[model samples]
Target chain A: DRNSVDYAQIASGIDTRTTVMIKNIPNKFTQQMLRDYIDVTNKGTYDFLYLRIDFVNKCNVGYAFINFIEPQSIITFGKARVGTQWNVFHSEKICDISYANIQGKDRLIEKFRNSCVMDENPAYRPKIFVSHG
Target chain B: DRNSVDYAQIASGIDTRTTVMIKNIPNKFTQQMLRDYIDVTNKGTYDFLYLRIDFVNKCNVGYAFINFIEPQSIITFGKARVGTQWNVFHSEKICDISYANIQGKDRLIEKFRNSCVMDENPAYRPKIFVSHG
Candidate 1:
């Protein structure tokens, strides 16, 4: 079964350095607002690889995955925000920032959904095991 | 040798869906300008995963890799840009778009640089093969 694993798919989602999890956000955050927040706070020193606002029911779920192009940017932001205010969208609520840790089958699904595939042999049915505790 | 391969690194760079290559571009396009062009032409319908302006000497190198979150967006963009005007930055120049394909060791370096790692093992010196033809 390990031989059948798609190693390529796993690699695509493995850039964990650039990805930061912005927790404790307002439940009504917008993607643009988060982008502007990072740009302004970081003196436009960072650009995003991807920004995912964890939205549900037409509202943000108080967190986001803000992946940056520069590893140092995220590192600096993480360090700076620890004892400082990180406000966005004109809300007084400050979000917490941490490195994004995506692993196992979830990472595989992330890359699969985000990227295109030229399936010359389209007979493989990919599977993942999820745990609930 | 194959067992020593960094399978996780290989997995991270495997997502080829969202990546697209835009060839035949003006050699003076900016990332912001390219973003606006996609936004306007696509009717604000698509968002970027990444917009890499292949820049050299402070100028674009006649092409870019404009990746999207939506697979359909790239599909549509590739389809629409064929025999159609894809102008940006007011130079009356149209660009070509195609699905991006990245492979080999280059892809490994990409995810490695972008993500953080917890090197518990801490003793592996990874090596890659290069061919010259």
Candidate 2:
């Protein structure tokens, strides 16, 4: 049927994705806050490939993993190294940035699978990590 | 007797002032743009102790040096290292950031000596790099 989807195609696409891991985020920061900051910082020139705020106990875990569809976006963002800090939310402390490792893929997939739209159960819906599979 | 100024104290204070050198700045960016971006990013919590834009031939030189009165300001800005990139103005390119060395002090002093307010000669006023001695 025309409605049928290709699972292989989808899985293959997911496998090649890469991510940027942001650390030292303030505990109380929210998803919209991150998006707003990024937009303003880049002058709305770039958009995140994927964004998911990991939360536990109804509070942000002070970190996030972002994927960029355009590989150049990473280069555009520049290389992250030690002694680098990003001021995302003004009064909040500066946030640290780094590239994610192999394990990051699983985390991204997990977030996608548990995303609000994917999960029919209201209780299982993520707070707001922005977008999903 | 009261009119005599303490030049030694002033020199000592100047010697203690430290600056952060921002390089690879986009040619068209300006001081207000930098300040606006920083304020928006940090929610107006910090201010540059001193800022001087270096220009040649009536154009920005893609770099600037900033001083901070508070030592913590540097820590707050973070230990500058390689591979750091900052997006100051939206349309412009990302700017690279780093701490200036001893030579930075000389540059700062030179800018101060040539500052519009200090020079008395109107022809030598710097376009804009915010604040000074």
Candidate 3:
């Protein structure tokens, strides 16, 4: 028999001090727009682990990895957006979150920045998941 | 301002009919062991997106991507384990799950099977994310 789990425990158990993958960002939203909304409106300090871009399509690849500088800020930001609609005019996208195995800009870059995901160089192939190109 | 979310609402909003990333699986657990637990004991059928394996250390590198065959089976399985302690002996592993963008064994294998993550060919470099070598 499958045992039941309480999601509240799951939510509480997350490590807020890590990079998170945010899916469902509108393809049209620019890197700066989402960054501003996250770091400015949310009043949080953070950097991207990687944000995918579609150079040919002139749009984002629909997701982004964000690393919040503070645990409280991560708690604050993710608390509101996870499972909530982005409602950003062009797209009624629902935002979803996940923990990224990689953390910190340096490490993520070292591991993925120029890795194969970027090497194959297809304009449509996303460089990373982000709200930008 | 930060808003509160009922994780229940969040959980309910999920697209369960998709591949999922399971984190915190013990490194020692073999790919077959986890596959059996997910596809057999759980009475579910599925394919792997990727399962990291360490050949030199002879243990999993941790984490896996699973794609359950049935919606009810997924609901049945994930309902039981999203943030629970694995309690699988050698490790008191905590299980945290997330959605994976990639799905299907073919696509995952095509994208990651021998992708750069495997290009370097280090025995320590994980070949794929799994419950094997």
Model 3's lDDT to the true fold? 0.52
> How do the residues B1-133 of candidate 2 rate in per-residue lDDT, one tens digit apiece?
2222223433555434355556665545555555554444333333232322222122233455555443344444443322345543453455445555423344545533431221235353222111112
Top-scoring candidate (DockQ): 3
Candidate 3 clashes: the total is 14
Clashing pairs in 2: A90-B42, A90-B43
Report the lDDT tens digits of candidate 3 across residue range B1-133.
Answer: 0222123444575444456667787755555556555654464356543444423222344676666554344555667776567775556778776656565555554544233222223342322111111
Can you give the lDDT of residue A20 in candidate 2?
63
lDDT of 1 by residue, B1-133 (tens): 2222222333466433554556666544444555566656565443332332211122333455443544555545655564455554455666565554442233423522342221224352211111122
Q: CAPRI band of model 3? A: incorrect
Report backbone clashes per prediction: 17, 2, 14
> Any idea what lDDT model 1 has?
0.43
Worst 10 residues of 2 chain B by lDDT: B124-133
Better of 1 and 2 by lDDT: 1
lDDT values of the candidates?
0.43, 0.41, 0.52
Q: Candidate 3: where are CA atoms >4 Å away?
A: A1-17, A115-133, B1-133
For model 2, how does the per-residue alpha-carbon lDDT over A34-112 read when each residue is reduced to its tens digit? 6565554433333332322222122343555565553344444433322344453454466555566423344545533
- The CAPRI-style docking tier of model 2 reads incorrect
Better candidate by lDDT, 1 or 3: 3
